[PDB]
Amino acid sequence: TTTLAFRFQGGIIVAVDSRATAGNWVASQTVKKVIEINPFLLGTMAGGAADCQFWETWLGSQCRLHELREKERISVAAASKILSNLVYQYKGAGLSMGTMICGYTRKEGPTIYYVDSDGTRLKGDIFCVGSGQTFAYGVLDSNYKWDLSVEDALYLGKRSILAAAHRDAYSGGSVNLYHVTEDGWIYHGNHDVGELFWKVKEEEGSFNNVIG
Amino acid sequence: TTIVGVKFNNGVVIAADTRSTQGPIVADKNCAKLHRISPKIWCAGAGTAADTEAVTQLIGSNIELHSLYTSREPRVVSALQMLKQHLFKYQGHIGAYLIVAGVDPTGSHLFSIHAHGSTDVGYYLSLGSGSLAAMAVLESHWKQDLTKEEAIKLASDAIQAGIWNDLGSGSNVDVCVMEIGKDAEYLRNYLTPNVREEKQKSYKFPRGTTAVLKESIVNICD
Amino acid sequence: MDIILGIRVQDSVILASSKAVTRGISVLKDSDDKTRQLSPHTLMSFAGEAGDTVQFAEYIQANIQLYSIREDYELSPQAVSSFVRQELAKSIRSRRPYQVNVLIGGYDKKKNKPELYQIDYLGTKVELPYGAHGYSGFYTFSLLDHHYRPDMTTEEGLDLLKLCVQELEKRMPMDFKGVIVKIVDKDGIRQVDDF
Amino acid sequence: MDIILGIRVQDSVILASSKAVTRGISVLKDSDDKTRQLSPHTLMSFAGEAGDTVQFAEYIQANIQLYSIREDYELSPQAVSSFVRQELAKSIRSRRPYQVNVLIGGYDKKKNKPELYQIDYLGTKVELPYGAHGYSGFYTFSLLDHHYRPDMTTEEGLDLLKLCVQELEKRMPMDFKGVIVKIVDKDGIRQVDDF
Amino acid sequence: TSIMAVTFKDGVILGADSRTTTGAYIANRVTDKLTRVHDKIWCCRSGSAADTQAIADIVQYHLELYTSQYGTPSTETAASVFKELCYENKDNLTAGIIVAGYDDKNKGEVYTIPLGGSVHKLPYAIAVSGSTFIYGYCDKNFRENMSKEETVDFIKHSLSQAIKWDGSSGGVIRMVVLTAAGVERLIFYPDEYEQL
Amino acid sequence: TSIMAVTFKDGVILGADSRTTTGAYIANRVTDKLTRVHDKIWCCRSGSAADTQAIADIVQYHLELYTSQYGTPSTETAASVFKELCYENKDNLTAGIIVAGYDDKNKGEVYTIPLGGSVHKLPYAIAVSGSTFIYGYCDKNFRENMSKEETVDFIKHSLSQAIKWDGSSGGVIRMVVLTAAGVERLIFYPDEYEQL
Amino acid sequence: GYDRALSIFSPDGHIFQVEYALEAVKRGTCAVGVKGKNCVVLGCERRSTLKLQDTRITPSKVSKIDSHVVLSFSGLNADSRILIEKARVEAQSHRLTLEDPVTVEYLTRYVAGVQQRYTQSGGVR
Amino acid sequence: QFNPYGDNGGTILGIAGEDFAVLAGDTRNITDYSINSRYEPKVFDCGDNIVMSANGFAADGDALVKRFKNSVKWYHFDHNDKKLSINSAARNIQHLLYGKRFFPYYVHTIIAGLDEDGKGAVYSFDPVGSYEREQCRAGGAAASLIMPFLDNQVNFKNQYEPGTNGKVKKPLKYLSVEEVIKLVRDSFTSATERHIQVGDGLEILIVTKDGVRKEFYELKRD
Amino acid sequence: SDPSSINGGIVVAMTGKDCVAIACDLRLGSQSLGVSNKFEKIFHYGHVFLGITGLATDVTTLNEMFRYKTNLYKLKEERAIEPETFTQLVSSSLYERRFGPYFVGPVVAGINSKSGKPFIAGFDLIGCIDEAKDFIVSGTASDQLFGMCESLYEPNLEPEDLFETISQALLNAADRDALSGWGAVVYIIKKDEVVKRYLKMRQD
Amino acid sequence: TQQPIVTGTSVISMKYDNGVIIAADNLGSYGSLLRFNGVERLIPVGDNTVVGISGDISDMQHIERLLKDLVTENAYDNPLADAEEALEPSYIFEYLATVMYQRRSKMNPLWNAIIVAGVQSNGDQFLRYVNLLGVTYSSPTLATGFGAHMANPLLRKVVDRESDIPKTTVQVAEEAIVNAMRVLYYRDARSSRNFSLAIIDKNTGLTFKKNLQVENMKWDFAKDIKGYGTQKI
Ligand SMILES: [Mg+2]
Ligand SMILES: [Mg+2]
């Protein structure tokens, strides 16, 4: 698994791989590792697939009840803390979660919270989670700037997953891209790693080690 | 694995299934579990496949050298004593479970050998994951003074019980018939009741289907 | 959560807390603030098990903020430290104990004296001129025992803290990504912007 | 013993090896050279179990120095790497195996080509344009896969190495106290004095 | 496994059940547990089948070599060889042996080498369940200088009771009678002994 | 521990040894293992002394309360109460109980509640060693409608043999005779029973 | 527990215990709220029949719920303390979970909710 | 110590067409090396044109199917006999599965039917209720044998247009019900040959707008 | 800590009409981490081809060992070893290390130079021979390969057709295994010519 | 979480053209293969059902009682309790199947393997298995423990598939069951000679045979077997 999210001038870029593995066996290459909490909030799936899917779908329900009662979009801070307080209650029971809660509100601006199953809740500009996180962080750290365009930021997210997909055995299949704006998130398509690798190799001149 | 040995009027018959398994996966759908120790002394193996083949060939080799040295046809009791003393020395770490059957100047013999080096005598024996299925058929239909044709029928029926009812056993029935004053006859695939049905579709690919990066002629010559 | 230091000087308390948050083989963050303001003249730094640290810190913060509203009065550092110790002492015989170590640095406006309290996860409270939690004490106490003076100024205290941080950066195997330093005095709580 | 990197460029091989030696909670040394010269044009960097690393390295050094005297000839990097692999492959089924991972960087004077070999403690040998051992590959391989070009100059290679070391210093929890960098080319082995 | 050896007027009788078990499965229901180590020295084996077969075969070799050089060996000598193998290799062996032999001088003799690797000479011995020897076992039931027919009936009854209460024991009752006359093999089928 | 209950013509007899052991130390050599749960309903306890004493005391309470409301309880009713406690609390109990009772309608009756927590009605029962019940134990030795004197001698012999071969059993033999006439307590000292 | 329904409907459709609670309010000392352009002012009456009072320590009629919200009241003084405590706890609870202080409308809606719950709970007035 | 879980073997296969969907399963129920039944169905019509199978531990699978069938029944009562859409069923099963997150149903669940646009739908679940919609999913013992074959023959993975230098992929397209049943039959006969736990019989439930139809086919019984 | 699945990788061998094919992936990893995309697992000693999956240090060691033994065989016998004989040598050499085995799944492929008969064989790590008419599979995606082979394979395929079958068998198996892939090589072996093709596959 | 102490061994059963047969030996077995006797493990419920139980005897006696309770309960406020609303094999099975599964799910199982044999009101044969895990399955032949390993293969030669049930008569079916019980006496250390057999026929009702013995046993060949290999005397 490789999931990343980062803040920039244009909002938030969220990029995930799509591979699920049981041992060395590849169960699926079509897994959705971005959970569409609601039209303004995104969550990333790392650790337990069920744990993330279930509790981030539940979070969407809690967020809907908040805006029905308060007549105001829930803040990313409030949404993240509902989930972090819930997993903290279950601490020691064996929940497995490594997620980024991503939203863009007027008050906060673009905001990312890393939330995990041992109760950690961290605000940050860049987060990578999964078996392939170290590979993604490498491409991100060296190329990341705040003043990145939306086009280049989307590529950087896609390129960082491809880096992890290549090296990490437990990451690959396809890349799912999201751009989070104040008005909501926009899906930027499913990109097969098979076709993307050869396309990126040729155009970028990277991956010389690989014959193509 | 299902292996049986059946004593009859003028000799002994051993049979086995032809399925080889790596856990739940079938590696070989038609392997031979009937091993020659000597021309008229045959061995059926269960447990660790490498160990049954290795132990059968070592004793088979030492028996041939002993036969040459003594100018005498090898005895089943010799194969038995040599197998059990070898297996015992390794305290079960060689996972060979054998049914040893054969004819020699002394007559017809049928023995079982356990990986720890214990041996038993019997008129009918079974070993392997299908031994209980096989033994149910032997305890049902075995009698004193069987004919050659009755003993082959009983043996192959005992293996079939294993093939159908035991997941560890399957495919075909191998038989070897060791009669006195006769050459032993090895009946490879005596029964083939598990023939694969015609497939619904041919999966032969149009040529060029596979993407290729490089071709090169390999030099196997000097 | 690794390094939390505390020095009580003549007229203030200085808390230094490492900025690094490490999860597995990666450093997730290098700007983490391991401190909560309990009241305008009381600061608490914390280190220990992930999640428990912040959950415990925020729980204490809420309870002190509740007392402040109810009585329209700021609870003394001694009182806040006694409350915090009791909560940790409850925790140790709980079903699942809070594994959190805290330093409470406060200025008592009644006594006009700075006070530093060191409380471990068992609820072991001690009042100290200087304190630390975990391995941090092993590299700095020898240094503090030597140079510490009770009549030190804030500037003298900050220089003595720099010496401790330098010794840690040299002989400590992990990179704690430097420290955030906060001073607690009669005028309240302020952060040293550059260290 | 943690970080050992290797990059094979157009005309040379660059080995970068961490300077830190950590025993328990203290960093004993910050200037350790985790490399031995096997022959004038062959360098070996090593990382693994304490004692075993140096003992193995010096043993290989002595055997290659013996061959050089006996035949008045410098064994090729391929030949040295094959010898080293066989020694490690013997070790793994020994009573007490050498837990040592090595990079062999050499310049083959016959082919006029730089060669980098990566051998793990099992005797798993592989020829690579760039290589690492342990967790070092997890933070730099993605970076190398991207920028590495096989027609790179020594200066381009050193800049690409700086990028890798910077990424390690940022995301790696342990402090490796920087790296010693050595270049192996047609003129022999030299150390980059400042990195 | 139920085995016993009883000394009577004319010699000694060896009796045993015919049941060998792997867990709850009866591997062999017609087991011959009466093993010849010499013409008139037999033994009953309990414990590991591999261990007792290996030991019995070595003792058979030693008594063959003894007979070649020094003539017919005493039952005491056979017991000694059994004990030596069992005692010296006690750490890697699970074997309990009852030795029954006939000499013309000493007449019938019974020796037990239990799991310890010790040697004991008794007028009779019973081993029931897991090589478990019973000291008493109806002391008043056994008399010295019993007739052959009394002794067969005494063993048949004792082994009948053991099979009834024990699932380890079962099948047929095998006996070997050791006398001056020679060696007699007796088999008693379930329908004879079950109605006792 | 060797305990047995035998039904005869006039009722039922309860017999047991008098030995209680902690490891190889005899904690009590004059133990009374015959426990009254009603006027003519006794039991023999094997297993944990604490567990069987706790259970016996609760059953005694239940039969006292039963007698107050519904009159004299049957031996079957006593066996049911024992079983209920043993079966429902099987996970935290180590108790094997033999129940012997006399009714004027049903005469002598024997029930066994073994470690399982099951109930079995038998003409007689023997428990030896660690609460180990023997199915057969000399079937031909026991006849139905035996005399009191035959039954005392049958139990005395059976318990004599058990003490001889078993170190858990020992001391004196205690018996309780349950009949229409009433309750008779018998004690047999080692010098009487050892020479059998 | 004491379960009796004290607040119930009358034939005319009124809940007399709720209406008799308003009578307790009417008896209470006057409280006034006036909101300006960039401020709110809370005025409160104190009956002058009580001389020899210690105004230092005597409970003040205006209570801070949080640093930014205040609550005044008319009616039973003892009852007011229970609503003020619940409101103050909810203010700190909101900050802890939402990471933001309560809006004035939210704090009101909470207090009104508590008052409502006591009009159709058993065993309470 | 008591182990509350067991493996009853068996393998299941769900494929989604354009205007149809199939859910297939072998009819063999096993424990270790024994055959419990040669015909024990584990693919069920649940009503509202939803077919379901919970393969793995048969007791947990029977329990889950029973609870879901009951969920369908109570959905009709509570919501005016409204039809339960396949997507609504899938979300319900997630809650059933995640209900036992800390004592899971030891089963791999697959449901098939038509979506609200009348297009073939297959949903697959892990033991604790993570789910996804898929064109193609094999579950259970022989999943590893069947799945890479489906990738090649259904989704045409790794097949390139002959002559295009491996630049133009073979184009995706909907298969007929006839062509899908061929792949199912060949998938299971292949798995039967190489997996000991697979065989005896194959039961396919086909779901169209016209309802739920059944087809049965014999498999080898060894 | 399971030696057979640290480095990963797969070998498959198939028989056709007067030809055999043997193919392998090129991946060497250290568990999750991909290390090399050029680790060939197929070696040849004259006209006898050996594929070896499992622990990479043993793959390298066994190649070096069988080169040694076949070189000495040729010098003494004055002829190249045949597939049938080489199979027995692999079996002997593996069982010699019975209680300290090489963690490998070797596959033999080749044509007998005398009889012209296509031959393939597979072994477990202690040298039990699996002789098969149809196909042999080895490695971390052996289950996947068995499935592909059992459905795709038909007898007496021509070299050009057999190439497609074995290629599709390997590619689709490697794509359903995390520890296999990163490139593939197929050897098509006729009586007196051998073609070696590198396949284009996804690099994840 | 428990361990069985006293246990019963295999229960075997098969369907014939007009009914089902079920058998079980009358033995209780201790831990180290020690033997109890006189245990009945076939429970007739009404006139159309027989429940065969293997495993813990204490848990068997509990299930015996539940079934007895079930009959009493069904009779309550039921004028058709001996006709249309009498207990069916399918009802008795589902109840037991429900109990087994909810007991395993509490981690306090009934340590049993159960076969419910009977004929339904429409004459349909009913044969179905449930065990301590609540796992259920039906087949023309069913057996527990050793019976599954040795009896099933023998019974499956008579009824290999569903279509063989019409061709199988009660005389043939009873022979197969009686023969299979002899095989289990030969080879199962925990089995006994004494057994009970029950036939449930749609025409002839339920026939319950007690104190049956294994007969026509072969032991004669044992006389000619000597030693473990080389011994001739
Ligand atoms: Mg099969
Ligand atoms: Mg792969």
mmCIF file of N, CA and C in Angstrom, chain C residues 42-108:
data_model
loop_
_atom_site.group_PDB
_atom_site.id
_atom_site.type_symbol
_atom_site.label_atom_id
_atom_site.label_comp_id
_atom_site.label_asym_id
_atom_site.label_seq_id
_atom_site.Cartn_x
_atom_site.Cartn_y
_atom_site.Cartn_z
ATOM 1 N N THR C 42 0.552 28.476 33.726
ATOM 2 C CA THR C 42 0.897 27.037 33.908
ATOM 3 C C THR C 42 0.963 26.327 32.550
ATOM 4 N N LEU C 43 2.117 25.725 32.254
ATOM 5 C CA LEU C 43 2.406 24.995 30.994
ATOM 6 C C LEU C 43 2.760 23.548 31.343
ATOM 7 N N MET C 44 2.297 22.587 30.542
ATOM 8 C CA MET C 44 2.619 21.146 30.714
ATOM 9 C C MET C 44 3.213 20.606 29.409
ATOM 10 N N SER C 45 4.421 20.044 29.482
ATOM 11 C CA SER C 45 5.074 19.266 28.397
ATOM 12 C C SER C 45 4.871 17.778 28.689
ATOM 13 N N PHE C 46 4.779 16.941 27.652
ATOM 14 C CA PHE C 46 4.440 15.500 27.783
ATOM 15 C C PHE C 46 5.188 14.663 26.738
ATOM 16 N N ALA C 47 5.468 13.408 27.101
ATOM 17 C CA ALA C 47 6.135 12.387 26.265
ATOM 18 C C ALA C 47 5.686 10.998 26.724
ATOM 19 N N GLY C 48 5.482 10.076 25.778
ATOM 20 C CA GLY C 48 5.111 8.676 26.060
ATOM 21 C C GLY C 48 4.412 8.022 24.881
ATOM 22 N N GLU C 49 3.491 7.098 25.171
ATOM 23 C CA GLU C 49 2.747 6.291 24.168
ATOM 24 C C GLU C 49 1.946 7.236 23.263
ATOM 25 N N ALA C 50 1.963 6.975 21.954
ATOM 26 C CA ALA C 50 1.244 7.745 20.913
ATOM 27 C C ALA C 50 -0.257 7.755 21.228
ATOM 28 N N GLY C 51 -0.933 8.880 20.979
ATOM 29 C CA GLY C 51 -2.376 9.056 21.239
ATOM 30 C C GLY C 51 -2.654 9.407 22.694
ATOM 31 N N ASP C 52 -2.208 8.555 23.628
ATOM 32 C CA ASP C 52 -2.358 8.726 25.101
ATOM 33 C C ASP C 52 -1.830 10.100 25.534
ATOM 34 N N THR C 53 -0.652 10.498 25.042
ATOM 35 C CA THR C 53 0.026 11.771 25.407
ATOM 36 C C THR C 53 -0.938 12.944 25.198
ATOM 37 N N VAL C 54 -1.399 13.145 23.960
ATOM 38 C CA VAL C 54 -2.252 14.301 23.553
ATOM 39 C C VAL C 54 -3.613 14.176 24.246
ATOM 40 N N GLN C 55 -4.211 12.980 24.234
ATOM 41 C CA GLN C 55 -5.533 12.706 24.859
ATOM 42 C C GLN C 55 -5.478 13.117 26.334
ATOM 43 N N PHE C 56 -4.445 12.679 27.060
ATOM 44 C CA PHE C 56 -4.237 12.997 28.497
ATOM 45 C C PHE C 56 -4.056 14.509 28.678
ATOM 46 N N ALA C 57 -3.171 15.118 27.885
ATOM 47 C CA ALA C 57 -2.820 16.557 27.958
ATOM 48 C C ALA C 57 -4.081 17.410 27.785
ATOM 49 N N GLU C 58 -4.880 17.124 26.751
ATOM 50 C CA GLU C 58 -6.111 17.881 26.394
ATOM 51 C C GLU C 58 -7.186 17.680 27.469
ATOM 52 N N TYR C 59 -7.259 16.480 28.052
ATOM 53 C CA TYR C 59 -8.203 16.121 29.142
ATOM 54 C C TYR C 59 -7.896 16.968 30.384
ATOM 55 N N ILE C 60 -6.615 17.077 30.753
ATOM 56 C CA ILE C 60 -6.140 17.911 31.900
ATOM 57 C C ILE C 60 -6.456 19.381 31.591
ATOM 58 N N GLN C 61 -6.139 19.826 30.373
ATOM 59 C CA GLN C 61 -6.346 21.223 29.908
ATOM 60 C C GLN C 61 -7.812 21.611 30.127
ATOM 61 N N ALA C 62 -8.740 20.763 29.675
ATOM 62 C CA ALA C 62 -10.203 20.979 29.750
ATOM 63 C C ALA C 62 -10.644 21.093 31.216
ATOM 64 N N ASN C 63 -10.116 20.242 32.102
ATOM 65 C CA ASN C 63 -10.497 20.189 33.541
ATOM 66 C C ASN C 63 -10.010 21.445 34.279
ATOM 67 N N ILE C 64 -8.822 21.958 33.938
ATOM 68 C CA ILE C 64 -8.234 23.185 34.559
ATOM 69 C C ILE C 64 -8.981 24.411 34.016
ATOM 70 N N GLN C 65 -9.300 24.419 32.718
ATOM 71 C CA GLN C 65 -10.077 25.503 32.057
ATOM 72 C C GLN C 65 -11.494 25.551 32.649
ATOM 73 N N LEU C 66 -12.060 24.394 33.018
ATOM 74 C CA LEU C 66 -13.394 24.286 33.673
ATOM 75 C C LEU C 66 -13.326 24.916 35.070
ATOM 76 N N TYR C 67 -12.316 24.557 35.869
ATOM 77 C CA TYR C 67 -12.105 25.081 37.247
ATOM 78 C C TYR C 67 -11.941 26.604 37.204
ATOM 79 N N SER C 68 -11.191 27.117 36.222
ATOM 80 C CA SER C 68 -10.910 28.566 36.033
ATOM 81 C C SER C 68 -12.219 29.336 35.819
ATOM 82 N N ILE C 69 -13.107 28.820 34.965
ATOM 83 C CA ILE C 69 -14.433 29.436 34.666
ATOM 84 C C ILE C 69 -15.314 29.364 35.920
ATOM 85 N N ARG C 70 -15.410 28.190 36.550
ATOM 86 C CA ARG C 70 -16.339 27.931 37.684
ATOM 87 C C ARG C 70 -16.016 28.864 38.859
ATOM 88 N N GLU C 71 -14.734 29.029 39.197
ATOM 89 C CA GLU C 71 -14.279 29.771 40.406
ATOM 90 C C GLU C 71 -13.748 31.163 40.032
ATOM 91 N N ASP C 72 -13.670 31.490 38.736
ATOM 92 C CA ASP C 72 -13.080 32.755 38.218
ATOM 93 C C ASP C 72 -11.729 32.984 38.910
ATOM 94 N N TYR C 73 -10.884 31.951 38.942
ATOM 95 C CA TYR C 73 -9.619 31.910 39.721
ATOM 96 C C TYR C 73 -8.639 30.941 39.054
ATOM 97 N N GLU C 74 -7.352 31.298 39.038
ATOM 98 C CA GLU C 74 -6.270 30.453 38.469
ATOM 99 C C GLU C 74 -5.703 29.557 39.574
ATOM 100 N N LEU C 75 -5.912 28.247 39.434
ATOM 101 C CA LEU C 75 -5.385 27.191 40.334
ATOM 102 C C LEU C 75 -3.854 27.286 40.364
ATOM 103 N N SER C 76 -3.238 27.177 41.546
ATOM 104 C CA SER C 76 -1.765 27.291 41.735
ATOM 105 C C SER C 76 -1.068 26.125 41.037
ATOM 106 N N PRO C 77 0.203 26.287 40.593
ATOM 107 C CA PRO C 77 0.949 25.189 39.973
ATOM 108 C C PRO C 77 1.004 23.930 40.852
ATOM 109 N N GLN C 78 1.198 24.101 42.165
ATOM 110 C CA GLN C 78 1.213 22.998 43.165
ATOM 111 C C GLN C 78 -0.118 22.241 43.096
ATOM 112 N N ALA C 79 -1.231 22.975 43.041
ATOM 113 C CA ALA C 79 -2.607 22.429 42.978
ATOM 114 C C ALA C 79 -2.808 21.675 41.658
ATOM 115 N N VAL C 80 -2.363 22.256 40.540
ATOM 116 C CA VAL C 80 -2.507 21.661 39.176
ATOM 117 C C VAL C 80 -1.680 20.372 39.116
ATOM 118 N N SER C 81 -0.464 20.391 39.666
ATOM 119 C CA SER C 81 0.471 19.235 39.671
ATOM 120 C C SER C 81 -0.113 18.099 40.522
ATOM 121 N N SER C 82 -0.728 18.421 41.667
ATOM 122 C CA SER C 82 -1.383 17.442 42.579
ATOM 123 C C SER C 82 -2.574 16.784 41.872
ATOM 124 N N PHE C 83 -3.380 17.571 41.155
ATOM 125 C CA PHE C 83 -4.545 17.087 40.365
ATOM 126 C C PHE C 83 -4.058 16.116 39.285
ATOM 127 N N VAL C 84 -3.036 16.524 38.526
ATOM 128 C CA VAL C 84 -2.447 15.747 37.394
ATOM 129 C C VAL C 84 -1.861 14.437 37.932
ATOM 130 N N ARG C 85 -1.141 14.485 39.056
ATOM 131 C CA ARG C 85 -0.530 13.283 39.684
ATOM 132 C C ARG C 85 -1.632 12.273 40.013
ATOM 133 N N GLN C 86 -2.717 12.737 40.636
ATOM 134 C CA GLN C 86 -3.854 11.882 41.074
ATOM 135 C C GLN C 86 -4.472 11.182 39.859
ATOM 136 N N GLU C 87 -4.613 11.887 38.731
ATOM 137 C CA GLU C 87 -5.183 11.336 37.467
ATOM 138 C C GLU C 87 -4.277 10.218 36.932
ATOM 139 N N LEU C 88 -2.955 10.409 36.972
ATOM 140 C CA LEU C 88 -1.963 9.388 36.540
ATOM 141 C C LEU C 88 -1.969 8.209 37.522
ATOM 142 N N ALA C 89 -2.072 8.470 38.828
ATOM 143 C CA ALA C 89 -2.097 7.437 39.892
ATOM 144 C C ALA C 89 -3.349 6.554 39.752
ATOM 145 N N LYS C 90 -4.484 7.127 39.328
ATOM 146 C CA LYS C 90 -5.726 6.383 38.968
ATOM 147 C C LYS C 90 -5.438 5.480 37.767
ATOM 148 N N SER C 91 -4.759 6.040 36.763
ATOM 149 C CA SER C 91 -4.482 5.422 35.439
ATOM 150 C C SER C 91 -3.698 4.113 35.588
ATOM 151 N N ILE C 92 -2.779 4.027 36.555
ATOM 152 C CA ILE C 92 -1.789 2.911 36.626
ATOM 153 C C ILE C 92 -2.488 1.598 37.011
ATOM 154 N N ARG C 93 -3.613 1.652 37.732
ATOM 155 C CA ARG C 93 -4.392 0.443 38.132
ATOM 156 C C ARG C 93 -5.694 0.366 37.323
ATOM 157 N N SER C 94 -5.779 1.108 36.212
ATOM 158 C CA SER C 94 -6.899 1.077 35.232
ATOM 159 C C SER C 94 -6.831 -0.203 34.393
ATOM 160 N N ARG C 95 -7.846 -0.420 33.551
ATOM 161 C CA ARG C 95 -7.895 -1.522 32.553
ATOM 162 C C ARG C 95 -6.785 -1.307 31.519
ATOM 163 N N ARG C 96 -6.631 -0.071 31.032
ATOM 164 C CA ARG C 96 -5.567 0.323 30.068
ATOM 165 C C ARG C 96 -4.938 1.642 30.512
ATOM 166 N N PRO C 97 -3.785 1.602 31.223
ATOM 167 C CA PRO C 97 -3.133 2.820 31.714
ATOM 168 C C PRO C 97 -2.611 3.787 30.638
ATOM 169 N N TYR C 98 -2.839 5.091 30.848
ATOM 170 C CA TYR C 98 -2.126 6.205 30.169
ATOM 171 C C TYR C 98 -0.623 6.024 30.414
ATOM 172 N N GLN C 99 0.149 5.799 29.350
ATOM 173 C CA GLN C 99 1.635 5.782 29.398
ATOM 174 C C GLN C 99 2.122 7.169 28.968
ATOM 175 N N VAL C 100 1.980 8.151 29.864
ATOM 176 C CA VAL C 100 2.334 9.582 29.626
ATOM 177 C C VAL C 100 3.204 10.067 30.789
ATOM 178 N N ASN C 101 4.315 10.727 30.459
ATOM 179 C CA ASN C 101 5.219 11.414 31.414
ATOM 180 C C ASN C 101 5.088 12.914 31.153
ATOM 181 N N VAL C 102 5.011 13.732 32.206
ATOM 182 C CA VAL C 102 4.758 15.196 32.065
ATOM 183 C C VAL C 102 5.743 15.982 32.936
ATOM 184 N N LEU C 103 6.102 17.174 32.458
ATOM 185 C CA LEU C 103 6.699 18.284 33.243
ATOM 186 C C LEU C 103 5.658 19.402 33.333
ATOM 187 N N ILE C 104 5.362 19.884 34.539
ATOM 188 C CA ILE C 104 4.470 21.060 34.749
ATOM 189 C C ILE C 104 5.344 22.229 35.209
ATOM 190 N N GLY C 105 5.471 23.243 34.352
ATOM 191 C CA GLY C 105 6.149 24.516 34.650
ATOM 192 C C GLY C 105 5.132 25.622 34.853
ATOM 193 N N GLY C 106 5.149 26.259 36.026
ATOM 194 C CA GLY C 106 4.187 27.315 36.384
ATOM 195 C C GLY C 106 4.830 28.417 37.199
ATOM 196 N N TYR C 107 4.269 29.626 37.111
ATOM 197 C CA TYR C 107 4.599 30.784 37.978
ATOM 198 C C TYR C 107 3.441 31.010 38.956
ATOM 199 N N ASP C 108 3.706 30.852 40.257
ATOM 200 C CA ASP C 108 2.727 31.071 41.356
ATOM 201 C C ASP C 108 2.677 32.569 41.673
#
